[PDB]
Amino acid sequence: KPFLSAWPSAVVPRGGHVTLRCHYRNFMLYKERIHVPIFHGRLFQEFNMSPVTTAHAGNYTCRGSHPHSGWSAASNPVVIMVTGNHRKPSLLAHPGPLVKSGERVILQCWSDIMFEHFFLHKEGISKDPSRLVGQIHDGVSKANFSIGPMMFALAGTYRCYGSVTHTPYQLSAPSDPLDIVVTGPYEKPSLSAQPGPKVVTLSCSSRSSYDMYHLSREERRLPAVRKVNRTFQADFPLHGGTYRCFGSFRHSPYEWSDPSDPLLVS
Amino acid sequence: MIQRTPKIQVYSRHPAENGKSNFLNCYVSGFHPSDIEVDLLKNGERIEKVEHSDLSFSKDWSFYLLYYTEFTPTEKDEYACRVNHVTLSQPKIVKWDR
Amino acid sequence: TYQWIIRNW
Amino acid sequence: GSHSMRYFSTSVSRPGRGEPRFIAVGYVDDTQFVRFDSDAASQRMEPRAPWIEQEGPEYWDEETGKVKAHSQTDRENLRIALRYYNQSEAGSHTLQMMFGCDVGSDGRFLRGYHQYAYDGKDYIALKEDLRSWTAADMAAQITKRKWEAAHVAEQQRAYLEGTCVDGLRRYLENGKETLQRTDPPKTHMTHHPISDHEATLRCWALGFYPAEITLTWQRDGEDQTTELVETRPAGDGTFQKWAAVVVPSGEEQRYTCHVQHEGLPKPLTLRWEP
Ligand SMILES: *[C@@H]1O[C@H](CO)[C@@H](O)[C@H](O)[C@H]1NC(C)=O
Ligand SMILES: *[C@@H]1O[C@H](CO)[C@@H](O)[C@H](O)[C@H]1NC(C)=O
Numbered sequence: 001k002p003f004l005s006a007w008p009s010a011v012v013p014r015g016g017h018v019t020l021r022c023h024y025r026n027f028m029l030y031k032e033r034i035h036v037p038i039f040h041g042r043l044f045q046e047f048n049m050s051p052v053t054t055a056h057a058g059n060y061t062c063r064g065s066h067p068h069s070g071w072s073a074a075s076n077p078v079v080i081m082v083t084g085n086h087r088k089p090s091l092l093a094h095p096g097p098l099v100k101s102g103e104r105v106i107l108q109c110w111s112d113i114m115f116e117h118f119f120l121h122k123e124g125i126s127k128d129p130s131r132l133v134g135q136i137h138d139g140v141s142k143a144n145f146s147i148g149p150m151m152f153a154l155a156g157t158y159r160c161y162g163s164v165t166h167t168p169y170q171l172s173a174p175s176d177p178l179d180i181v182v183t184g185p186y187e188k189p190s191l192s193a194q195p196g197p198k199v200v201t202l203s204c205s206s207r208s209s210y211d212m213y214h215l216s217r218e219e220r221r222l223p224a225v226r227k228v229n230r231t232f233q234a235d236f237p238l239h240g241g242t243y244r245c246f247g248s249f250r251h252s253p254y255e256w257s258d259p260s261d262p263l264l265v266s
Numbered sequence: 267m268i269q270r271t272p273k274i275q276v277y278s279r280h281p282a283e284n285g286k287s288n289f290l291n292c293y294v295s296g297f298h299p300s301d302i303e304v305d306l307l308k309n310g311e312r313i314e315k316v317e318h319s320d321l322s323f324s325k326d327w328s329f330y331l332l333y334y335t336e337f338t339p340t341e342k343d344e345y346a347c348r349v350n351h352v353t354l355s356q357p358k359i360v361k362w363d364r
Numbered sequence: 365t366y367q368w369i370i371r372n373w
Numbered sequence: 374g375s376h377s378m379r380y381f382s383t384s385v386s387r388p389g390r391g392e393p394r395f396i397a398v399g400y401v402d403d404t405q406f407v408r409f410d411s412d413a414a415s416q417r418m419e420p421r422a423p424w425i426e427q428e429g430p431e432y433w434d435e436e437t438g439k440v441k442a443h444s445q446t447d448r449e450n451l452r453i454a455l456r457y458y459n460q461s462e463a464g465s466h467t468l469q470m471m472f473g474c475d476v477g478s479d480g481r482f483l484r485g486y487h488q489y490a491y492d493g494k495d496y497i498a499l500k501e502d503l504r505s506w507t508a509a510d511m512a513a514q515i516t517k518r519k520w521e522a523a524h525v526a527e528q529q530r531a532y533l534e535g536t537c538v539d540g541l542r543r544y545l546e547n548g549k550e551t552l553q554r555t556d557p558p559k560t561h562m563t564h565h566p567i568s569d570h571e572a573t574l575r576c577w578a579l580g581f582y583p584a585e586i587t588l589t590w591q592r593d594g595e596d597q598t599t600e601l602v603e604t605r606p607a608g609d610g611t612f613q614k615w616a617a618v619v620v621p622s623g624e625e626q627r628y629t630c631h632v633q634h635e636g637l638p639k640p641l642t643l644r645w646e647p
Contacts, residue, residue, distance in 0.1 A: 003391050023390050152372040153449045186522040208522040249519055251456040255372075257522065268493035279607045281579075293605045298493040299467050300383055319606075320408040320421070321396045322381050327469050327490040329383075334608050365540030366380060366399075366418075366439035367472050367487075367532045369446050371525050373453045373516040 002027070004062050004075035011121055011129065011161075011171070014084040017050035024064030024072050032059040032077075049080075057082040057169035079128065079169065083161060086172035087113055091160045093178055098216070098256075099155075101184035104148030107158060109175065110140050115162030118143035119171060123157040134162070147180065155182040155254035181254050188258035189213070189247050194235075197265045202243060204260065205233040210247030214256060218242030240265035270328050271353035272297035276346065276362045282339045290337045290362065292347035295330035303350035303357070304333045308343060339364070374635075375483065376402055376552070378541040379473035384447040386466050393451060395444040400473075401544050401552050403584040404610065409440040416441070424548035443470075454491055457512035467492055472529075474537040480545075485533030489513075503530040556582040556611055557636030562645045567619065574645055575617040576630030580607065587633035588616040597628075 002024040012018040020029065026045045029038040043065075049056045061074040089111035099105045109118045114136070119129040134141035141162075147154055158178045161171040189206035204213040210224050213234035218241055224232040236245075243263050246256035272294040279289035290306055290313075300321055306313040319332045337345070345362040382397040391412070398421075399407040406422040417437040420426045451468050460466070469490040475483040488498035495509040497516050504526050508517040520526070545552055558578035566572040576588055584604050589596050600617040607613050620628055625645045632641040 003389070005389050007389070021389050151370070153445065186519065187524070209518045210522075247522070250515060251453070252519075270493065273603060275602065275605050277605065277613070279609060289608055291605070291608055293603075295603060299465065300385060301387075301465075320398045320405065320410065321383055322398050322400075322405070323383065323469060327493050327495075332606050332608060365536050366397075366436050366443070367536070368439055368528070369443040369470070369472075371520060371523060372446065373450045373457070373489075373513075373519070 002062055002064050002072050002075035004060065004078045005126075006078050006080060009126070010078055011081050011083060012052050014053065014082055015051045017048065018052055018056070018080060020044075020047040020049070020060060020062070020078070020080075022047075022062035022064055022075060025066075027062050027064040028071070030061050030063070030074065032061075052080075052082055054082050054085060054167075054170050056080055057167070059169070081119070081129070081161075081169050081171050083171040084173050085167070085170045086115075086162060086164065087111075088173040089113070089115065089118070089160055089162045089175045091158065091175040091178045093180065097179055098181050098183055099148070099150040101151065101182050102149050104146060105150065105180065107145045107147055107160070107178065107180070108142060109145065109160035109162070110142035111162055111172075112140055113162060113172070114141050114164075115172070116141075116165045117163045117168055118145075119161040119163070120145045121159050121161065121174075122154075123159065123177065125156075129161070150182045152182060152252070152255050155180055157254075179254065181256055183246060183256045184258045186247060186257035189245060189260050191243060191245050191260040191263040193263065193265060197240075197263060199240065200238050200265060202236045202238065202245070202263070202265075203233055204236075204245040204247070205231045206247055206257075207231065208247060208257075210257070211250040212248040212253075213245050214248055215243060215245045216259075218244075218262070238265075268298055269353050270296055270298040272302060272329075272349055272351055274347060274349050274358065274360045276360050278339070278362070278364075279334070282364045284340050285338065287336065287338050289334050290345055292333040292349075292360075293330070294333070294349055295324075296326075296328045297330075297351060297353070298328050299352065300329045301352070302329075302331065303348075304331065305348040306333060306335055307346040307348055307359070308337075310346070313337070374478050375475060376541060376545060377473060377475040378537060378544065379471060379486075382443060382447065382470045384444075384451055384468040384470075386451050386464075388463050388465065393448045395447060397440050397443065401541065401548065403582070403612070404548070404552060406544065406548075407436065409437070409444070411444055422548065422551070424551060425544070427547075450489075454512070457515060458491075469493075472533075472537075474533050474541060476538055476541055480538075480542050482534055482538045485529075485537065487529045487533070499526065499529055503533055551610070554582060555636045556580060558586065558632060558634055560630075560632055560641055560643055562630065562643055564625070564645055564647075566622070570622055571619050572622055572625070573617055574620055574625060574628055574630075575615050576632075576643060577613075577615045578632060578634075579613045580611045581613075581634055581636055582611050583635065584612045585635070586612070586614055587631070588614055589631045589633075590616055590618045590628060591631060592618075592620075592624075592628045596631075 007019045063071045092108045094106040115134045121129040132143040159174040192203045194201040215236045222234040224234045227233045244259040275293040316335045350357040379400045395411040397409045409418045472487040474485045489496040497513040498507045508514045558581035563575045604614045630643045
């Protein structure tokens with residue numbers, strides 16, 4: 001069985017570019033016209049779809065040349081989804097985008113546009129988007145995607161999409177991105193204020209070697225400094241409120257420590 | 267990237283006796299990375315029904331695999347092992363020596 | 365008996 | 374005597390050729406007993422030795438759940454590895470892991486291991502004390518910092534001291550006739566002349582278990598360190614090895630091959646004769 005893959009991504013903006021590669025041992029392409037070669041039987045050899053149009057949207061399989069037979073069995077299914085064909089939906093995190101390790105979160109996609117299907121896509125994942133039917137209520141169509149149990153693989157930047165009934169692979173423009181962050185189990189840091197909480201600067205320190213600290217009010221980001229006494233700190237300059245901070249490491253922007261204990265600035 | 271060419275050993279499970287059922291083995295070891303092409307050949311022809319063990323490695327992290335098939339040797343039958351690897355520009359053929 | 369391997373690099 | 378249990382896993386990325394592939398194997402001593410292979414249809418842990426085949430269904434469900442969990446973890450670590458080493462997503466890479474434990478003759482814990490390699494080179498390893506980590510380069514220093522911040526060595530220590538040794542002891546009883554067996558080598562010598570003034574003496578050892586063995590050639594007592602071949606599996610659970618030396622014609626009697634193996638009551642001293 002040939003292995004079919006899209007590159008760089010099967011979710012591709014109109015006007016963008018995607019290459020279908022078909023690895024075997026010359027090859028032809030098919031769309032779910034199961035026995036009809038695409039493009040009147042083109043032998044692609046080296047398929048660079050560019051610029052991508054809505055005609056490229058589809059569910060594809062390939063077969064490669066096999067002289068001692070003269071073709072292979074069909075490839076794995078790759079669904080090319082073309083985005084940018086309707087106005088964008090909205091994406092909301094319930095209860096919020098900060099998710100304790102091991103817990104769960106609902107990512108709700110909704111729109112005033114009446115989408116028959118919703119797709120949820122983590123940026124940079126080659127996995128097939130999750131698909132749900134749009135449910136209708138009060139002038140909006142919506143979908144609750146359940147994410148979890150949380151772990152590093154599920155943290156990252158998410159977008160959701162809508163499609164309409166007769167063009168299920170023609171997706172809307174992406175919603176504004178939502179960053180979903182996994183917190184824990186790294187040891188929580190300490191939050192303090194300078195001169196103090198009544199007024200200001202908030203200091204986050206820890207014995208663990210975080211490269212970044214993140215201050216969240218009931219977010220903001222800054223690099224920690226090696227400081228001294230073997231402590232990694234960061235100072236965030238600021239009407240007060242409930243504040244926490246989280247440590248984070250290089251090359252892992254979506255995984256944070258347990259939250260510091262809450263601190264109240266009044 | 268570290269890269270290790272495979273050592274190759276072609277041999278029989280039991281002492282070869284013409285007319286006696288046996289197993290032809292090709293043991294490849296010490297190679298990195300793990301993708302490798304191994305064929306048992308009989309008079310230059312690939313033998314079908316070749317089995318192989320599950321991929322494993324040693325303390326040096328270098329890989330090893332055993333390829334084997336049932337075979338009855340004869341005086342007129344020349345057996346060999348053909349190994350291809352990233353570290354080999356041409357496939358390497360090692361003859362079985364009784 | 366396998367070990368739970370859950371910690372990412 | 375002493376014994377060991379080891380799990381070995383290999384993760385391989387192959388962009389454009391397949392999804393990342395994960396293979397895990399479990400060994401007791403030189404005897405493989407389970408495998409899991411991501412590309413296979415079972416998508417579960419399978420027995421590879423007769424004596425584990427009578428573990429109940431809950432065992433296989435439990436073990437499958439854990440090795441599938443490992444598969445997901447190591448495929449993300451490939452992705453992380455691309456970031457730590459600032460490598461492109463087109464290349465193929467290898468992520469290898471080993472964990473397990475040794476016990477002595479009395480069944481008590483002796484040693485535990487939990488190490489990783491990336492691209493055939495050491496990455497990070499749990500130290501003998503089961504409390505601290507050895508990081509082999511600057512990328513692993515990151516992982517080390519994370520794992521210290523997570524206090525994860527505690528979980529490794531509880532598994533190595535408890536779960537791992539408990540399992541090893543159970544398997545030693547389950548496969549006693551096979552794991553605690555001791556097959557001695559069947560030995561012989563071949564002779565082939567290389568030239569008009571030299572000849573090759575090859576000392577052979579076949580059919581032995583376990584795989585540890587010493588073949589040595591001595592010429593009048595002093596070992597003439599010679600050609601040694603790596604010990605190889607016969608395919609039936611026994612191993613084979615040979616050692617060869619080049620000798621002056623008319624001197625084969627001065628040379629003796631020496632065989633040391635746990636299956637032998639007394640080490641063997643073999644001398645060639647036509
Ligand atoms: C794509 O096609 C395959 C078979 O042609 C089908 O099984 C699959 O459900 C289709 N859709 C998606 C989203 O993969
Ligand atoms: C989706 O989840 C939210 C929780 O934030 C809930 O209030 C809502 O009713 C759910 N949607 C449906 C259709 O039940």
